[PDB]
Amino acid sequence: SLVNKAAVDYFFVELHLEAHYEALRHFLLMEDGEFAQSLSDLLFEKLGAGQTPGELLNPLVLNSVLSKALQCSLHGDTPHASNLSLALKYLPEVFAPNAPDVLSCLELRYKVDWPLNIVITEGCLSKYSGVFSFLLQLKLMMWALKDVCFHLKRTALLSHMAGSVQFRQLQLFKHEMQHFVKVIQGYIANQILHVTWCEFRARLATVGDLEEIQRAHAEYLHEAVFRGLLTEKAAPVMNVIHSIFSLVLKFRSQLISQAWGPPGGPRGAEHPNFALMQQSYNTFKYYSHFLFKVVTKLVNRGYQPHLEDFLLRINFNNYYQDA
Amino acid sequence: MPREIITLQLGQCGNQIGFEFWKQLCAEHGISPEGIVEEFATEGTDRKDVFFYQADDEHYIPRAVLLDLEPRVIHSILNSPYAKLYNPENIYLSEHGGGAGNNWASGFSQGEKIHEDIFDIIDREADGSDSLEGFVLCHSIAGGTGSGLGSYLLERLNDRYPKKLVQTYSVFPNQDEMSDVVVQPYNSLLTLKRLTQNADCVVVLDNTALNRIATDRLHIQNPSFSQINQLVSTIMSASTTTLRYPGYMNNDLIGLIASLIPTPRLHFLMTGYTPLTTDQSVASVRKTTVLDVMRRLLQPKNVMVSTGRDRQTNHCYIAILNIIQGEVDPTQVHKSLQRIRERKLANFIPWGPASIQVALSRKSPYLPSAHRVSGLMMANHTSISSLFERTCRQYDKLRKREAFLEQFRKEDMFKDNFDEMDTSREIVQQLIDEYHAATRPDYISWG
Amino acid sequence: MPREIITLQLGQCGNQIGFEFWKQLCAEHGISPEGIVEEFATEGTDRKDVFFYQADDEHYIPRAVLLDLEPRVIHSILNSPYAKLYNPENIYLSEHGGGAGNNWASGFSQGEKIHEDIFDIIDREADGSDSLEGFVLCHSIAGGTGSGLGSYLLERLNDRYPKKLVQTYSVFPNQDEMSDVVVQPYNSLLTLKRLTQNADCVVVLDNTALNRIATDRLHIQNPSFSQINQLVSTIMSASTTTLRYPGYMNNDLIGLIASLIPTPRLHFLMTGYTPLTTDQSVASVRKTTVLDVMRRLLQPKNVMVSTGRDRQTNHCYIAILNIIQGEVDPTQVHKSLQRIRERKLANFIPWGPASIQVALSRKSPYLPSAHRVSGLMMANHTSISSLFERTCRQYDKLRKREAFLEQFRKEDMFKDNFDEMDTSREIVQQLIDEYHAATRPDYISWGT
Amino acid sequence: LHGLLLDQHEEFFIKQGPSSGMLAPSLKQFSLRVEILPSYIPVRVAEKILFVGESVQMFENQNVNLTRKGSILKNQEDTFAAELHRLKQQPLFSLVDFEQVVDRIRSTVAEHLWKLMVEESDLLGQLKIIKDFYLLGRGELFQAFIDTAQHMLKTPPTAVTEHDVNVAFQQSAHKVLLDDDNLLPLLHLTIEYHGKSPREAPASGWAALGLSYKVQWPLHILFTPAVLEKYNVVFKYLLSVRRVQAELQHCWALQMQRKHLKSNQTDAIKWRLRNHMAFLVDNLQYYLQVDVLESQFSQLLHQINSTRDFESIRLAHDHFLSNLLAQSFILLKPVFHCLNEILDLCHSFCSLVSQNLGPLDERGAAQLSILVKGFSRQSSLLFKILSSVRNHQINSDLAQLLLRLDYNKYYTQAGGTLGSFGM
């Protein structure tokens, strides 16, 4: 007991385990909102422009993006932000269009010194990097859809296309997809990013030994993955979510690929990809309804109680129950 | 980088709203009334660059351009605590001091005369913004100065930043309160016209709802235009806290508004806040739960839109996103959703996916929050059409009655007739109908 | 969810009775006259959602609709501390303040003028009710405003809530007091008509019996009309406490009334209470036993219906339910049942199972009880037919005599004839005969 | 002293029983070897020793999971060890001194356990929760829940339907303003029956729905599986009673909804039969609540507050449960089956009355006549049984029920049969 107490005190005061968790929150959890916004915008611009990993993940480009995000972030200049590094897991030859995992090659690593590397294990840092990569991919998809929406808005403003039936339908589909994605993101953030982070702080505050500290950090990462739907049991659910995100990205690409035309007729402005955007929207809606039905069946099957929360987040206003 | 917002304060109400907004931002960031960060303001976590520019490393200047056709409001601003917040070179006051005579057209013509100075002010505020997205104009549609100058500012922002979005916060006249601006419906119509032609998104702020909230919630028997503008500025501050305090979520305006704006034309948004407390009731930090928050949000006293009682159309919310700031338990959110479902507290559109989005935002460390959990809701609700329909009906009633037109007749735009006001009312009616249509399945084929 | 009850207050007298009922319910539930729960109202064992709606997150408002053809009572309610208890959209006050002139038809016509508004109020209250069971109308049947407005309210409840139960509180005229409402027999006829056609249950409250109880039990030498209405509201509160204070049994209105209503038409209930104590007589805590209570309940002075001595009908109880509120010992309940059976205090129908049911309930902690143990009995008793037969005979006598009908003749319902009163009298006569039949094995066909 | 059975060679008169159990090996891990029990060890004394050993094993097992709360006897354990050493030094074995020491240790441990259970472990709160949920103590709440969930629970249960029923229960609780998020996790919906494995059932899925309650440590010692099964049986019975009450209330609502319809003789007969059934069911439910349920719960609470022995509290709760089981006639299999048939006839009558607003159709008239005959026969049988039990003084509750049912002597005049609803 004396050894455990002295170890807890040493880890908190000397090893700054709390400070390491704070750094993880600042950098890996994107607490610097400005840095995260700049990173997401740059990522979605590069993905939508079709930049290859050799072009996008080039050290000059990655360093410029990181520097710009840190300079625009109020926390980007913090010493905890300095512990962030954007690394490549692999170099893709070509950015696959509408792939949600396009930016999964990025990894954020956190360096742990001895003896903290006994508690903050390489497996823990790998899990943190995976979570960061997933959050970056989701932010890239959301940013890409936002950029498509802004492009359509700007084209309407320049061309007075407010009356366009095709533009309005595409904008409504984009808005509904963005609402759904933001509800899912908020659910994941609350459970994995907020609840599990609070649990980690309580557990880090309760760690008595290096193995107990390692256990607490592993529990934090496990809770983040489970609430994040990153568990193998959620892999079919996670794969379906990735497929839905891919369809959303494809719809975004179809909308963004062309600007709105001038309003030529009583139907308003026509988009050259309008038929493709409408088909992508219909497929997204079908897949959303199938996802809702599957999640409901799984919750009623008791296999995935956290998926009941996922269904609630999807159908919070019962919009998907009435459809 | 944050999407910076330039605030344009027009007329008495607009200038009051801008002053109260700058006061609230200063208090949240610990900025003195002179624009200097207070020694206690050690939490450098606030985003001043969204709404303020730095004149030096110590002096924070609001990214605000003040344009008015009447000197009274500018003099009141220079006597306000925010007089030193704004760049004095970014403040345009009409030299003649004669005002717009409560005529929107006179205010617009004065804005046109001060167009160069106003757009120079806007550009100066933009250069202080690291990643300026565009301009947000805060004004009232009911006066002469705030309406005409607000429309002028919107026009000049559209001219200078034609590839940038222009959102306006246009306060529509109170329909339950007798407006001292008898020409208020004409001014409101002209402002809605300018929002339709030169703004990309118009958030309708019904002064009737502000007065109702002041009466029922703030216990203000007669809410002044200044008090309504200060309430609007407080609401804007609370909704913008997630922009001013960057965090894990809701770090950009587009992410917040994407769920609320289904079509470029269907851009009439309704707002909700919870928990609603009167400024005087700060004393009791109520441990409001997400269930309690959601229950309070359903109270009309907290809704910033005065929708008429339409008996024929069952106006409804298409979608609602609540961004909650403060201590929030996810389990409380879950219990809130459960109670809402059991009580059927929210109806959503039936034709597409819609949900309650949740954004978590930090509170200002320098401003003590009386509420453990606070939240802004952005929602697309067909009842927002009732505010726009009511404004249109009032505009048409004034133009058809030529009421207060003699003050408007002094300006060339309104000298002979109010046909521009009636066409504006018709356009606003079509906008209301489209917002109501967005509650219906046929919204897919709208336009 | 609780079975919510909408309270309908009809005419001047009915609105006064409803206001006093809501006051008593608020006192029992610890609700202030402004709709705020009193700090003493810590006993969350009462079902407020049955009788009250929340006006805000903090204020509970009674589900009461105040409708009057005379402005005096409605204005007094709106000028009282209880102004916030009633839904203001459910409050209709006649601008003329002239009342119905003790004419049922005038009150009915006033209800008809506010029919749309009244049914909108009822629907709004139902939507404000999580599990609205139906409407309860509080009115007097003897006046003009309360009687006609009560008939209107019954009609509108039937129109708006045709699948929901509609209970009425129909005040029969005092036979010992000279009623100022000369058209009361006509008013009584219109109320009985509406109870037969548009109400689902009519609780007959004979003001003569109320006055007798006030004199002998409440020690009220001259019960005022306001005092009679407050006694009726107190009796209704005590009988409904098990609905308003949820417990193991009688948790819903339909479950409570199912045993009481042998036929859909035979919905005329009599009430009894024991022990009866006056609010002023709290000083002497009488050790009243449940057996002593049951013995007192069988006394006609304790029956809330003033039945004439019918010599022709072997009047009997069709069913008896005693709702007892307060501290009750099960052994005392057992002794009470023993004394009731040994004394044959209730004669039952021969055509179905019937007994004196006894429910023990806790008292409201917020309402001071003048009695250590109290109980309300609701009973279907064929002697209520003698009250109902007397009401029917008075109705027929007024319609055949057109007495006080000229005030009613101003309103379309009574302008040309009193045929609605005569049909109501015939229906009430058939009800009396069925209640006499309900004492007989032919009770299986009672009310046909 | 350690709950440790140090018997590798079965030399002690205690034999290790199969532990029924980090389900810590059930205190039945140790058992008395009656075959090995010395004749000089009294069976009563052997039972006391068994209780003591079980208590020691339970205490060690709880202290394995419980933070280092010391022994109930703390430093007095060694004092009893010294007394036992003196007994070992005694030239003659005295059963009296050994039993006295054992009883002192037992009393100390039992008093500390009672204190922990009542003050530290709030046994009363758990018993109140169990009464409200397992024993339907919140009868108005469970009535409202039944009324709201009836549409979900009227159908056969499915493997997924349990989730829907639990959701409906939570929704009704919020509607009944039961916002106890701690209680809802204690309520568990059950198990598919009859087509919605849904394969096996006696009656239908509506009858197969049950509630299970997870008893926490150390209270899991109190809520044994047999106790949980009895609680589930009581829940099922109360739910059936509430369902029949709801059916009668729905028949009353339909009659009231049909009050504008001229009451025909078939409709009057249906309503009359429903009214007689409602009166009888209401009086029966009041009897069960107050004279059985409330009486037994009050007795249990009074004994628990009156006792400082945890085992005494457990005995009081077991007595309350036994009284509930006896007064409900659950043990009287033929009476229980006859009551079930009577309940089914009453439910059919209430359904017929609720379905028919007007006069009974030919199918409705046939159903009404069948229900009337069934109800009259079952009620005559019930009245005869109740009168026999009153005459034999076998069950006070049956005599009270007989008095309540024939209070106005209607059933006595009707021969104990609920009057035939004339179709």
UniProtKB/Swiss-Prot annotation, chain B:
SUPFAM superfamilies: Tubulin C-terminal domain-like, Tubulin nucleotide-binding domain-like
InterPro entries according to UniProt: Gamma_tubulin (IPR002454), Tub_FtsZ_C (IPR008280), Tubulin (IPR000217), Tubulin/FtsZ-like_C (IPR037103), Tubulin/FtsZ_2-layer-sand-dom (IPR018316), Tubulin/FtsZ_GTPase_sf (IPR036525), Tubulin_C (IPR023123), Tubulin_CS (IPR017975)
Any Pfam family the entry gives: Tubulin
Residues found modified as Phosphoserine: S131
Post-translational modification: Phosphorylation at Ser-131 by BRSK1 regulates centrosome duplication, possibly by mediating relocation of gamma-tubulin and its associated proteins from the cytoplasm to the centrosome.
Effect on the protein of changing L387P: In CDCBM4; the chaperonin-dependent folding and hence the yield of monomeric gamma-tubulin is compromised
Compartments where found: Cytoplasm, Cytoskeleton, Microtubule organizing center, Centrosome; Cytoplasm, Cytoskeleton, Spindle
One cellular component (GO) term of this entry: non-motile cilium
Keywords: Cytoplasm, Cytoskeleton, Disease variant, GTP-binding, Lissencephaly, Microtubule, Nucleotide-binding, Phosphoprotein
UniProt family annotation: Belongs to the tubulin family.
PANTHER family to which the protein is assigned, alphabetical: TUBULIN
Pathology noted in the entry: Cortical dysplasia, complex, with other brain malformations 4: A disorder of aberrant neuronal migration and disturbed axonal guidance. Clinical features include early-onset seizures, microcephaly, spastic tetraplegia, and various malformations of cortical development, such as agyria, posterior or frontal pachygyria, thick cortex, and subcortical band heterotopia and thin corpus callosum in some patients.
Protein name as catalogued: Tubulin gamma-1 chain
Primary gene name: TUBG1
Curated annotation (Swiss-Prot), chain D:
Tissue expression pattern: Ubiquitously expressed.
Molecular-function GO term, any one: gamma-tubulin binding
One GO CC term, this protein: gamma-tubulin complex
Subcellular location: Cytoplasm, Cytoskeleton, Microtubule organizing center, Centrosome
Keywords of the record: Cytoplasm, Cytoskeleton, Intellectual disability, Microtubule, Primary microcephaly
Location (main, coarse): cytoplasm
Keyword Transmembrane helix part of the UniProt annotation: no
BP term (GO), one: mitotic cell cycle
UniProt similarity note: Belongs to the TUBGCP family.
Disease entry from the Swiss-Prot or TrEMBL record: Microcephaly and chorioretinopathy, autosomal recessive, 3: A disorder characterized by congenital microcephaly and chorioretinal dysplasia associated with poor vision and nystagmus. Variable ocular anomalies include microphthalmia, retinal folding, retinal detachment, optic nerve hypoplasia, absence of retinal vessels, round areas of chorioretinal atrophy, and attenuated electroretinogram. Most patients have mild developmental delay and mild learning difficulties.
Subunit organization: Component of the gamma-tubulin ring complex (gTuRC) consisting of TUBGCP2, TUBGCP3, TUBGCP4, TUBGCP5 and TUBGCP6 and gamma-tubulin TUBG1 or TUBG2. TUBGCP2, TUBGCP3, TUBGCP4, TUBGCP5 and TUBGCP6 assemble in a 5:5:2:1:1 stoichiometry; each is associated with a gamma-tubulin, thereby arranging 14 gamma-tubulins in a helical manner. Gamma-tubulin at the first position is blocked by TUBGCP3 at the last position, allowing 13 protafilaments to grow into a microtubule.
Task performed by this protein: Component of the gamma-tubulin ring complex (gTuRC) which mediates microtubule nucleation. The gTuRC regulates the minus-end nucleation of alpha-beta tubulin heterodimers that grow into microtubule protafilaments, a critical step in centrosome duplication and spindle formation.
Protein name: Gamma-tubulin complex component 4
Organism: Homo sapiens
Range of the intact protein held here: 192 to 667 of 667
